[PDB]
Motif scaffolding. Structure first.
Motif, PDB file in Angstrom:
ATOM      1  N   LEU A  17       1.068   7.506  -4.616  1.00  0.00           N
ATOM      2  CA  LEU A  17       1.447   8.181  -5.849  1.00  0.00           C
ATOM      3  C   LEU A  17       0.893   7.447  -7.058  1.00  0.00           C
ATOM      4  N   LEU A  34      -6.863  17.730 -14.794  1.00  0.00           N
ATOM      5  CA  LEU A  34      -5.977  16.593 -14.597  1.00  0.00           C
ATOM      6  C   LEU A  34      -4.528  16.915 -14.931  1.00  0.00           C
ATOM      7  N   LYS A  35      -4.194  18.183 -15.161  1.00  0.00           N
ATOM      8  CA  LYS A  35      -2.845  18.570 -15.547  1.00  0.00           C
ATOM      9  C   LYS A  35      -2.029  18.883 -14.301  1.00  0.00           C
ATOM     10  N   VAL A  36      -0.883  18.219 -14.165  1.00  0.00           N
ATOM     11  CA  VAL A  36      -0.094  18.257 -12.942  1.00  0.00           C
ATOM     12  C   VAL A  36       1.376  18.421 -13.298  1.00  0.00           C
ATOM     13  N   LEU A  44      -8.875  14.889  -6.299  1.00  0.00           N
ATOM     14  CA  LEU A  44      -7.941  15.333  -7.326  1.00  0.00           C
ATOM     15  C   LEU A  44      -6.898  16.285  -6.766  1.00  0.00           C
ATOM     16  N   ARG A  64      -6.158   9.717 -12.157  1.00  0.00           N
ATOM     17  CA  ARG A  64      -6.294  10.782 -13.140  1.00  0.00           C
ATOM     18  C   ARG A  64      -6.012  10.293 -14.555  1.00  0.00           C
ATOM     19  N   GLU A  73       4.284  16.695 -12.889  1.00  0.00           N
ATOM     20  CA  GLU A  73       4.475  15.279 -12.618  1.00  0.00           C
ATOM     21  C   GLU A  73       5.958  14.955 -12.491  1.00  0.00           C
ATOM     22  N   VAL A  74       6.229  13.756 -11.979  1.00  0.00           N
ATOM     23  CA  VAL A  74       7.582  13.426 -11.539  1.00  0.00           C
ATOM     24  C   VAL A  74       8.475  13.062 -12.722  1.00  0.00           C
ATOM     25  N   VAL A 116      -0.076  15.399  -3.286  1.00  0.00           N
ATOM     26  CA  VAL A 116       0.869  14.285  -3.214  1.00  0.00           C
ATOM     27  C   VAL A 116       1.996  14.492  -4.216  1.00  0.00           C
ATOM     28  N   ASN A 117       1.632  14.829  -5.454  1.00  0.00           N
ATOM     29  CA  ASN A 117       2.632  15.063  -6.490  1.00  0.00           C
ATOM     30  C   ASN A 117       3.556  16.213  -6.118  1.00  0.00           C
ATOM     31  N   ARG A 168       1.119   9.744 -19.802  1.00  0.00           N
ATOM     32  CA  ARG A 168       0.827  10.720 -18.762  1.00  0.00           C
ATOM     33  C   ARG A 168       1.925  10.787 -17.706  1.00  0.00           C
ATOM     34  N   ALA A 207      -2.949   7.860  -7.232  1.00  0.00           N
ATOM     35  CA  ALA A 207      -3.391   9.145  -7.757  1.00  0.00           C
ATOM     36  C   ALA A 207      -3.158   9.240  -9.259  1.00  0.00           C
ATOM     37  N   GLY A 232      -4.449  14.439  -4.742  1.00  0.00           N
ATOM     38  CA  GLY A 232      -3.427  13.814  -5.564  1.00  0.00           C
ATOM     39  C   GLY A 232      -2.399  14.809  -6.062  1.00  0.00           C
ATOM     40  N   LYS A 233      -2.849  16.008  -6.436  1.00  0.00           N
ATOM     41  CA  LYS A 233      -1.910  17.041  -6.851  1.00  0.00           C
ATOM     42  C   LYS A 233      -1.002  17.459  -5.704  1.00  0.00           C
ATOM     43  N   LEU A 288      12.877   5.506  -7.426  1.00  0.00           N
ATOM     44  CA  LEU A 288      11.736   5.766  -6.559  1.00  0.00           C
ATOM     45  C   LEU A 288      11.777   4.873  -5.322  1.00  0.00           C
TER      46      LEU A 288
END
Ligand SMILES: CCCCCCCCCCCCCCCCCC(=O)OC[C@H](COP(=O)([O-])OCC(O)COP(=O)([O-])OC[C@@H](COC(=O)CCCCCCCCCCCCCCCCC)OC(=O)CCCCCCCCCCCCCCCCC)OC(=O)CCCCCCCCCCCCCCCCC
Ligand SMILES: CCCCCCCCCCCCCCCCCC(=O)OC[C@H](COP(=O)([O-])OCC[N+](C)(C)C)OC(=O)CCCCCCCCCCCCCCCCC
Ligand SMILES: CCCCCCCCCCCCCCCCCC(=O)OC[C@H](COP(=O)(O)OCCN)OC(=O)CCCCCCCCCCCCCCCCC
Ligand SMILES: CCCCCCCCCCCCCCCCCC(=O)OC[C@H](COP(=O)(O)OCCN)OC(=O)CCCCCCCCCCCCCCCCC
Ligand SMILES: CCCCCCCCCCCCCCCCCC(=O)OC[C@H](COP(=O)(O)OCCN)OC(=O)CCCCCCCCCCCCCCCCC
Ligand SMILES: CCCCCCCCCCCCCCCCCC(=O)OC[C@H](COP(=O)(O)OCCN)OC(=O)CCCCCCCCCCCCCCCCC
Lengths: 318, 344, 48, 115, 80, 171, 105, 140, 171, 98
Positions: free
Chosen positions: C26, F12-14, F56, C33, F16-17, F62-63, G104, C29, F59-60, F24
């Motif tokens: 996590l 790159l827009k996700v 990429l 980005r 996110e957590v 994963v998110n 971010r 990644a 990774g998305k 965590l």
């Protein structure tokens, strides 16, 4: 807020040094069948302040044969290092958490030697030079044993940080696995600080106030309080490393109070040791600490290298 | 000294250069040079007199600065390339600083003012070691990087060593200084050709060793340190004149002896690369290097000098000093020219 | 006693490092980005 | 900034205290109290003369033993390696060799002082 | 020589303990059974990430998930 | 000379957590059992290919898997989990040994509901053999074509022609 | 070397930590590991004089990864132009360069 | 700058007498400064003024050597037009030796330096003319 | 707080300068201690703790013996500190002036590459591993016991033989 | 990094210039050697930490080891110089020319 924490870490240590003076005098007295100060205050609780004010009102001395720069900058270095050593002390949560705390301690103390050793040179006198050379011999005696003792002790900890020993001693003191290391560390802390039986720098009846005979005022007060602060520091280190008090993550104040008790006992032991024994000769000290402590120190270093392995007790890195 | 100390010190002297060879890391080469430095001093200073103290101090102070300069060069190379080996495409300033420090280590001129003094201030042994075993590893450093070196100052240092060694050894009555200046000239001959076919450097080095060691033994056999002391040799040890003559006339390169072989093939491999007139200068000043050898063997062999009355006890008594390698090293020298293609 | 205590500590360290193992990707990644975001910002600025 | 802050604060404490010690009191300066002490009578000579020390060899070997301390001190990091045998043997060799050197100095009477 | 040791234990006991502890430090690792576990524990500590491997279809001794029966099981550190 | 090809911002827009580290670490051990195939495929992409710009979407994913994980935590076992990570954040190294009565509650809740079992001591620290429809990267490092080495001289050698051609030595 | 004893015996006393890309204690890549690896693998079998001109692109890339001069000069030029514009009253930086952004993660 | 001393050979002898002249004079002064440094470091004087006098003596001496050498060379090339002739360099070297014998009051040194410098300078011109390379690169 | 490292480097330069002027070994060793402390601080600034602390320890231990010896052998009746010589004071001031002037010059002769005053603090650390563990110095230095077991042998032998060397020189 | 490396190089150069340019005393020269050692240590360590080459981090410790051995033997020879001449000065070591 960090400055208020600096206050809480600085001013009580100075009060405690100033009252270690009184405790010294009274314990030496009652060990000498007499009473210490009881006149100026109810039980002498103002004699340190009287002493300090009298020193800071006496005219200083800038003699003609001396080097003023070292003369003035050495007491500064002495107090500054004696007061900076207290900074990463975990009691249980320190002010400055360093990953190489004991290295900072060793370096700061080996630099604290240079206060004595430059003051004695700048004071262009025979007795001051005697004292400086005696300090050279003293450091040459004890530093090797200090480093190797602390190495073999922390070889069952896993790190040079001081916060880790509070976890290493969660269930037991390190005095039981290593009482000999604790013994020789105690005598090293005794030769360090130029305390009895290893005074050998302010050797009143050999060197009439060596490294201080030309110092009169607040400079002499600075040297004095630096000694009486490093004493409490070394006792605090003894009780943090070996006599590990109780952590209890909910209650750190319990750690602080047990630390207080143990450091008080060890400082009282320093005074007791002063009152009991005479002085060594500063070649007997080198011979002792090179021919009795260093072979045994190396052998126990070997043993504490083997011991994590054949026990499968290697400590962790963080 | 006691046997354990001698074992330690001689083993360290053996391992200094042996570490300096079997080591790709330049840092470990520096370590070996420091071993040689550190372990030679107890034997330069074994007699404990002012001359020995001065010699040891001068050696230490001259060699430590060169060690530090070599370490500067190594650290700069590591900063440049992230490697502990002199590649190509390093900096010429780095390489030249290295070369100058090694020249100070060997004794090459103008960095030569310390070697005759030190060799004078010590016994006949430890002049032998100082001139033979301590020249090898410093030469190994250069041998391993011979394409990276500047052909200009390598030759200027060579020529200066030749000139100064000849003009120094011309007027020395003390033999411990004559051998030092001979060393300086021979190192000049080596370092001139070192960027050109470096095997000839090792050739001249082995020839120089095989000559000097018997010579230092010849001086040992009666503790000779002066022309007037080696001149009293027709009465003490008159069977050494022949070998001393042939070995001095080898050191000064003359044809039928193998000491002309290094100069000859060095001039050959220089003329192959158009280093004509520098080679001519070196060849011509080697004659001035030869002149005092000729004077020396005149003094001892051909016009036998006055002796003393006390030298007859020496005739009565006996000796055991020649070590069975004097003959071998003196006969492989002075007689091994026809084996030159087997030498090169 | 110290053998057993350090034996347990070498087990708790395994636990903590295993948590770090589980959360390596996590952070990897997000860091990737984020660096790419910053570099695109720098380039869009350099253009003007 | 925290450690720098603490050390600056202690430096200021000491300098302020020395300023107080030197500029608060009253002075009567003259040469009979600014000349060196030496127990009543005056010095026969200077203190800036050669002081023959008699533990110089012990000082050198203290320097060497400090280097050996430096070599030994990475052990709390060395022990976490996978081998545990090369480091065991090398630490044993290091300590035994140091102690052998100490025994040689002891027997050859370097630890003794030049009488 | 037993009498020499009986002497050297009264006169100069410090060196006796030093040599004895030196020999003990060297000798006890050879003797213990717990010595091998030190290297294994140092090897188990996963400071770096375990990089997965691509499935060729010919890796049956490797698991396809953490909690499978395969791989080096650390049940010896537990209940040691 | 060549330019760097960088993605755009919307690349790159996700989702996110926006979540802290104690909370965590408290769920790490179950996030290593669940949401493992995606994580390990992302790792193989990121390590087999040395370019973040080519991993990429992994990774998305994963998110997104982490989001679904925490949402399944937010449906059942939200308050025991809150208690757990709230006691865990109090520490300075965020250690587990000080919060060990709340592990039991969190694990019992998440074993009753959602049926997740916690991994053992060393299960998350071993290679784990993922598959994927991707191809291998041909020539990572973008290594240029190497130059050919100098050729070997083939032959069983013989004496030197006329011996040593030195100056005048015959043999 | 001069006396290649290590090759004669197979040992590696010191020839396994010569360069950056060589087995750090825990497998942490030294920076420019890729570039040094590439240079060393291009200059193998070849020796010296030919590798000094047939693997010059890779040496240049490594020299720019390690000493890192062209990036310094590039950012210097950018900052110079930016200062010039900001003193001419032409350029204003955005929110995410004066310390006002949406972080971010 | 190396170009300043390499400009001695961009036009032949007999042309630009002044340029070649104080080029060679600067060269001689450089070498004299080197000699003075070596003569003051080793074998120092009884005082810094004596040392500076030594330095000035050496330096202006060598400058005179170089000045007369360059003047005589470009003159004997201007007269008797023959730039590709080392005898001009020989005559200039002899003038240099005679100046060395003037500043250092000795006829023996005068003739010695004349012969030696003249042969050296003639060999220098033969090298510049035929393509001789002191300090060559390794080629084999 | 970006010119930190340039300040520390320049103080090290000044310390080595006053060292090179060679006053009494007292003030010289004081300069050594100051410069070693400063070197420790800059090595820390580049992310190195153990090496700096060991510098400080070792140089303290050395300068102690240096004081002991200089009080015995290298002492004068007038030790000749810095200010005692107008000439040495002038060389010190001139060295500081030339430091400033040469840095200003190298800040002009090239845009960047030798000294960068406009760009300063931007180039210190060079690709940190923002996620890492077992990353500090001490691991590399402890590799003398594993993966570098030749350095340990050779340094140990150096010290062992040094003992005998010292005994024989002093005998 | 480049600025501090330049300054460290200049510091080594100053210490070298010092140890070359003698004064009456010798221990000052030995101290200049120590300063050279310190500067080289710092440059090596800074390079190792910049490049993150932990395998080279054993090198500065070896430098310190051998450098303090050099200082040790220099100090031994200093003892000898004092025992002979009594005054530590360098201008008395002038009897090897004869
Ligand atoms: C040529 C360089 C000569 C330098 C000048 C030396 C000199 O001045 O003569 C000494 C002269 C002093 O005369 P001396 O005191 O009667 O001689 C004492 C003898 O040692 C007294 O010795 P001894 O009488 O007890 O025994 C005699 C001894 C006599 O042997 C000798 O001492 C001299 C032998 C040298 C032979 C050289 C032959 C040259 C060959 C050229 C080809 O042995 C022999 O019988 C000769 C055996 C055959 C020759 C052995 C030589 C082997 C070495 C070969 C080297 C070749 C290099 C060329 O002066
Ligand atoms: C210091 C680290 C090394 C850096 C180079 C030195 C730079 C400072 C040089 C100052 C000149 C000092 C001098 O010449 O000696 C005079 C003095 C000797 O004094 P004195 O013995 O001649 O007595 C002077 C008497 N009065 C006061 C009446 C004039 O020695 C020194 O100052 C050297 C000590 C270190 C100085 C550092 C000062 C920094 C501030 C710290 C407080
Ligand atoms: C009259 C003159 C008297 C002069 C007195 C001088 C006092 C010196 C006292 C001796 C100190 C020597 C040792 C240096 C300080 C300790 C170094 C250290 O190891 O810790 C530095 C600290 C963090 O270090 P670390 O633990 O390795 O990493 C932390 C990761 N979270 O964080 C840092 O890196 C910052 C360290 C800054 C040190 C401040 C020094 C102040 C000097 C003022 C002069
Ligand atoms: C192609 C042709 C080439 C031919 C060349 C051949 C040259 C042969 C040279 C032999 C010379 C020997 C001369 C000795 C004669 C004896 C003179 C004498 O009586 O001794 C005294 C002499 C001092 O005389 P003087 O010069 O006046 O100095 C004192 C005044 N203050 O004291 C002396 O000077 C003693 C002699 C010392 C000799 C010095 C070194 C000679 C070097 C010879 C050249 C070597 C070749 C080098 C090539 C380059
Ligand atoms: C770059 C450009 C290069 C230019 C080269 C110029 C050539 C310079 C010539 C060599 C200088 C020799 C100086 C000299 O004359 O030596 C004197 C010195 C002793 O001085 P003193 O006896 O008082 O003077 C007597 C007058 N002849 O005698 C000595 O102390 C011997 C010193 C000799 C050292 C010469 C080394 C120079 C070459 C270096 C090669 C690299
Ligand atoms: C290079 C050319 C040197 C020319 C000599 C200039 C004279 C000088 O100041 O340096 C000599 C000095 C030697 O020391 P000393 O013999 O004692 O001189 C008398 C001082 N009382 O030298 C020294 O003591 C050491 C000088 C080191 C200077 C380092 C700083 C360089 C920047 C200025």
């Amino acid at each position: 807020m960090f400055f208020i924490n600096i206050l809480t870490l600085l001013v009580p240590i100075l009060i405690a040094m100033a009252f270690l003076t009184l405790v010294e005098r009274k314990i030496l007295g009652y060990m000498q069948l007499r009473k210490g100060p009881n006149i100026v205050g109810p039980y002498g609780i103002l004699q340190p302040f009287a002493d300090a004010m009298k020193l800071f009102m006496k005219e200083p001395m800038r003699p003609l044969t001396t080097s003023m720069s070292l003369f003035i900058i050495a007491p500064t270095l002495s107090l500054t290092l004696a007061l900076s050593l207290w900074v990463p002390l975990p009691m249980p949560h320190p002010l400055i958490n360093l990953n190489l705390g004991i290295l900072f301690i060793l370096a700061t103390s080996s630099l604290s030697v240079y206060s004595i050793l430059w003051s004695g040179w700048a004071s262009n006198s025979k007795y001051s030079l005697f004292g400086a050379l005696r300090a050279v011999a003293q450091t040459i005696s004890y530093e090797v044993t200090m480093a190797i003792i602390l190495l073999s002790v922390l070889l069952m900890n896993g790190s040079y940080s001081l916060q880790t020993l509070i976890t290493t001693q969660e269930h037991m003191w390190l005095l039981l696995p290593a009482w000999p290391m604790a013994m020789m560390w105690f005598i090293s802390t005794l030769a360090e600080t130029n305390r009895a039986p290893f005074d050998l720098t302010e050797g009143e009846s050999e060197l009439v106030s060596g490294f201080n005979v030309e110092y009169a005022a607040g400079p002499f007060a600075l040297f004095f309080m630096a000694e009486y602060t490093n004493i409490i520091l070394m006792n605090a280190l003894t009780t943090i490393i070996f006599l590990g008090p109780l952590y209890y993550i909910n209650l750190p104040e319990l750690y602080s109070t047990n630390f207080m008790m143990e450091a008080l006992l060890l400082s009282s032991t320093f005074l007791w040791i002063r009152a009991s024994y005479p002085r060594f000769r500063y070649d007997q000290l080198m011979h002792l600490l090179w021919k009795n402590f260093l072979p045994l120190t190396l052998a126990l270093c070997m043993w504490h290298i083997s011991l994590p392995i054949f026990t499968a007790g290697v400590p962790p890195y963080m | 000294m006691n046997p354990i100390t001698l074992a330690i010190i001689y083993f360290t002297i053996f391992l200094g250069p042996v570490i300096t060879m079997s080591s790709t890391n330049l840092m470990l080469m520096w370590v070996g040079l420091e071993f040689s430095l550190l372990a030679i001093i107890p034997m330069l200073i074994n007699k404990k007199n002012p001359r020995s103290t001065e010699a040891a101090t001068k050696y230490f102070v001259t060699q430590a600065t060169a060690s530090m300069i070599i370490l500067l060069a190594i650290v700069l190379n590591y900063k440049q390339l992230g490697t502990w080996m002199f590649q190509q495409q390093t900096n010429g300033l780095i390489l030249n600083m290295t070369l100058m420090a090694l020249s100070m280590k060997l004794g090459l001129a103008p960095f030569h003012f310390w070697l005759p003094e030190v060799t004078q201030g010590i016994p006949l042994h430890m002049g032998l070691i100082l001139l033979t075993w301590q020249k090898i590893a410093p030469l190994s450093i250069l041998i391993q990087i011979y394409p990276l070196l500047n052909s200009t100052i390598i030759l200027m240092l060579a020529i200066t060593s030749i000139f100064m060694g000849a003009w120094g050894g011309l007027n020395q009555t003390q033999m411990r200084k004559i051998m030092a200046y001979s060393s300086i000239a021979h190192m000049g001959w080596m370092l001139a050709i070192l960027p050109y076919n470096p095997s000839l450097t090792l050739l001249n080095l082995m020839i120089y060793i095989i000559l000097t060691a018997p010579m230092f033994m010849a001086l040992m056999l009666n503790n000779s340190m002066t022309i007037n002391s080696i001149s009293l040799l027709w009465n003490k040890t008159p069977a050494m004149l022949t070998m001393i003559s042939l070995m001095l006339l080898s050191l000064g390169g003359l044809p039928p002896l193998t000491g002309f072989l290094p100069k000859w093939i060095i001039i050959t491999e220089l003329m192959k690369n158009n280093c004509l007139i520098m080679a001519t200068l070196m060849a011509m000043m080697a004659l001035l290097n030869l002149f005092f050898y000729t004077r020396l063997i005149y003094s001892t062999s051909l016009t036998m000098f006055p002796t003393n009355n006390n030298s007859k006890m020496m005739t009565h008594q006996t000796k055991t000093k020649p070590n069975l390698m004097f003959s071998t090293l003196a006969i492989m020298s002075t007689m091994t020219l026809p084996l030159a293609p087997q030498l090169i | 006693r110290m053998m057993r205590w350090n034996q347990e500590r070498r087990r708790l360290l395994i636990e903590d490092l295993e948590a770090r193992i589980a959360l390596m990707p996590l952070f990897q990644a997000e860091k990737d980005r984020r660096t790419l975001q910053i570099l695109r910002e720098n380039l869009e600025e350099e253009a003007i | 900034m925290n450690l720098y802050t603490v050390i600056f604060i202690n430096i200021l404490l000491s300098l302020t205290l020395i300023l107080v010690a030197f500029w608060l009191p009253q002075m009567n300066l003259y040469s009979e109290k600014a000349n060196p002490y030496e127990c009543g009578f005056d010095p026969t000579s200077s203190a800036r003369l050669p002081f023959s020390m008699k533990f110089f060899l012990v000082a050198i070997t203290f320097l060497l033993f400090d280097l050996e301390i430096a070599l030994l001190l990475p052990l709390p990091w060395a022990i976490q390696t996978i081998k545990t045998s090369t480091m065991m043997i090398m630490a044993f060799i290091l300590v035994t060799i140091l102690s052998l050197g100490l025994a040689y100095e002891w027997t050859q009477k370097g630890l003794e002082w030049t009488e | 020589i037993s009498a020499f040791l009986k002497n050297a234990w009264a006169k100069e006991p410090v060196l006796v303990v030093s040599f004895s502890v030196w020999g003990l430090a060297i000798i006890m690792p050879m003797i213990s059974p717990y010595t091998k576990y030190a290297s294994m524990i140092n090897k188990a500590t996963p400071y770096n990430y375990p990089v997965p491997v691509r499935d060729d279809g010919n890796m049956p001794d490797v698991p396809s998930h953490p909690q499978d029966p395969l791989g080096p099981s650390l049940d010896w550190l537990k209940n040691l | 000379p060549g330019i760097v090809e960088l993605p755009t911002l919307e690349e790159l827009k996700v989702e996110e957590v926006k979540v802290s580290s104690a909370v965590l670490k408290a769920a790490a051990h179950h996030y290593g059992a669940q949401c493992d195939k995606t994580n390990k495929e992302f790792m193989l992409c990121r390590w087999e290919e040395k370019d973040p710009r080519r991993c990429l979407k992994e990774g998305k994913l994963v998110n997104g898997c982490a989001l679904n994980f925490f949402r399944q935590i937010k449906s059942h076992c939200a308050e025991p989990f809150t208690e757990y990570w709230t006691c865990l954040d109090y520490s300075n190294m965020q250690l587990f040994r000080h919060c060990r009565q709340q592990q039991a509650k969190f694990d019992q809740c998440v074993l009753d509901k959602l049926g997740w079992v916690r991994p053992d001591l060393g299960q998350l620290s071993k290679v784990t053999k993922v598959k994927t429809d991707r191809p291998l990267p041909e020539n990572p490092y973008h290594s240029r074509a190497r130059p050919e080495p100098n050729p070997v001289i083939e032959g069983d050698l013989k004496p030197a022609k006329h011996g040593t051609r030195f100056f005048f030595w015959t043999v | 070397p001069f006396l290649d004893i290590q090759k004669k015996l197979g040992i590696s006393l010191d020839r396994h930590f010569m360069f950056l890309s060589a087995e750090q204690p825990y497998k942490n890549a030294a920076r420019c590991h890729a570039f040094e690896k590439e240079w060393i693998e291009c200059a193998h079998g070849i020796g010296g004089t030919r590798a000094k001109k047939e693997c010059k692109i890779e040496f240049d890339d490594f020299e720019e990864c390690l000493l890192r001069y062209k990036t310094m000069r590039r950012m210097h030029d950018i900052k110079k132009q930016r200062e010039k514009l900001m003193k001419e009253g032409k350029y204003t930086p955005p929110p995410h360069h004066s310390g006002r952004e949406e972080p971010r993660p | 700058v190396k170009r300043f001393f390499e400009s001695y050979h961009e036009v032949p002898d007999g042309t630009q007498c002044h340029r070649k002249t104080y080029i060679t004079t600067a060269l001689g002064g450089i070498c004299g400064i080197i000699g003075s440094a070596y003569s003051v470091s080793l074998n120092p004087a009884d005082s810094t003024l004596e040392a500076v006098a030594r330095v000035g003596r050496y330096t202006f001496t060598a400058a005179a050597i170089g000045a007369m050498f360059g003047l005589t060379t470009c003159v004997s090339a201007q007269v008797r037009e023959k730039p590709d002739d080392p005898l001009n360099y020989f005559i200039g070297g002899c003038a240099g030796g005679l100046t060395l014998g003037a500043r250092t009051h000795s006829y023996g040194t005068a003739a010695m330096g004349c012969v030696y410098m003249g042969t050296a300078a003639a060999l220098f011109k033969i090298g510049k003319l035929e393509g001789w390379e002191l300090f060559p690169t390794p080629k084999v | 707080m970006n010119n930190y490292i340039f300040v520390l480097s320049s103080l090290f330069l000044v310390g080595c300068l006053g060292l090179a002027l060679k006053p009494s070994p007292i003030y010289g060793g004081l300069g050594l201690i100051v410069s070693g402390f400063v070197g420790c601080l800059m090595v820390l600034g580049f992310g190195g703790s153990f090496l700096g602390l060991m510098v400080f320890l070792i140089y303290l231990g050395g300068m102690l013996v240096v004081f002991g010896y200089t009080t015995a052998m290298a002492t004068e009746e007038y030790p000749e500190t810095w200010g005692s010589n107008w000439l040495i004071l002038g060389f010190l001031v001139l060295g500081v002036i030339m430091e400033v002037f040469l840095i200003c010059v190298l800040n002009y002769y090239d845009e960047v590459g030798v000294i960068n005053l406009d760009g300063l603090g931007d180039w210190l650390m060079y690709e940190v591993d923002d996620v890492g563990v077992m990353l500090e110095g001490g691991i590399g230095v402890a590799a003398m016991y594993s993966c570098a077991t030749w350095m340990m042998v050779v340094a140990g032998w150096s010290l062992f033989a040094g003992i005998f060397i010292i005994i024989e020189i002093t005998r | 990094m480049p600025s501090t490396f330049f300054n460290l190089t200049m510091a080594f150069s100053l210490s070298l210039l010092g140890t070359l340019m003698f004064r009456s005393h010798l221990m000052s020269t030995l101290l200049c050697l120590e300063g050279m050692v310190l500067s080289l240590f710092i440059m090596t360590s800074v390079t190792s930490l910049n490049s993150n080459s932990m395998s080279s981090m054993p090198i500065p410790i070896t430098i310190l080891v051998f450098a303090a051995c050099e200082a040790a033997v220099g100090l031994a020879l200093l003892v000898k110089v004092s025992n002979t001449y009594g005054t530590d000065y360098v201008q008395n070591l002038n009897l090897l020319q004869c």
